[PDB]
């Protein structure tokens, strides 16, 4: 049950988000197997979402950091927003900044599943209509060639 993330399922997510939007997660974990809403959204907001800032320091970011982190002893999500940088990264790069001080199968089947799912937009009703209508067309054409062959007998 203890899971980690393949780029397979990861991409299936980013596709899903790219459709259903952020807030409908319990659907985003339908496509995606093996996973939950809070798991999905956890990885999304904390890692995957592109708008996040993953990059180096700067002396603005650094002196800024030791400043803030000294002022607020452990309050990381606060300080994180203060840096507009992800949480555990700010924590990590921080600790490193003081570490200078020293003395392919069923995944392809799930991908068939979701990959098939996205491409149908309607819902049960519309599809039911498509059927009903076509059945009507066949009925029409039949009734016609009835009449056509009756005309080949002359009786109209």
């Amino acid at each position: 049950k203890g899971g980690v993330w393949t780029n397979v399922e990861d991409q299936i997510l980013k596709a899903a988000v790219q459709k259903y939007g952020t807030h409908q997660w319990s659907k985003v974990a339908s496509l995606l197997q093996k996973k939950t809403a809070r798991q999905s959204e956890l990885r999304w907001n904390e890692y995957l979402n592109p708008k996040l800032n993953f990059t180096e320091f700067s002396k603005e970011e650094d002196a800024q950091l030791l400043d803030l982190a000294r002022e607020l002893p452990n309050q990381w999500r606060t300080i994180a927003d203060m840096m507009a940088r992800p949480a555990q990264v700010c924590v990590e790069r921080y600790n490193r900044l003081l570490e200078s001080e020293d003395s392919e199968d069923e995944e392809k089947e799930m991908l068939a599943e979701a990959r098939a799912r996205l491409l149908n937009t309607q819902g049960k009703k519309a599809t039911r209509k498509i059927r009903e209508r076509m059945l009507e067309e066949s009925k029409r054409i039949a009734e016609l060639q009835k009449r056509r062959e009756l005309k080949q007998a002359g009786i109209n």
Binding site: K1, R38, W76, A87
Partner: protein
Amino acid sequence: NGPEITPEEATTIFSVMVEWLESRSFSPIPFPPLTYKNDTKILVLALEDLKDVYASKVRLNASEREELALIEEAYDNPHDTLNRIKKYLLTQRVFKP
């Protein structure tokens, strides 16, 4: 608007607790030691406390089952878990929502 306390109040308060405790002659708590004589007991307690939530229930939802698992294993592997914890406190500063 910034934090409300003002440094003034802060300092007075801190000093208060200090004179109290010195006066009270108090030894602070240590970190739970790896070699502990009572330890398994305490862990028995805490885990029973979580267990009890689920004693009554007949249908367990997802998060629940996740839990009961984590417990049952924690009974099974006490040294494992205690090590896991003492790690977690020594380090992890960021948490799930």
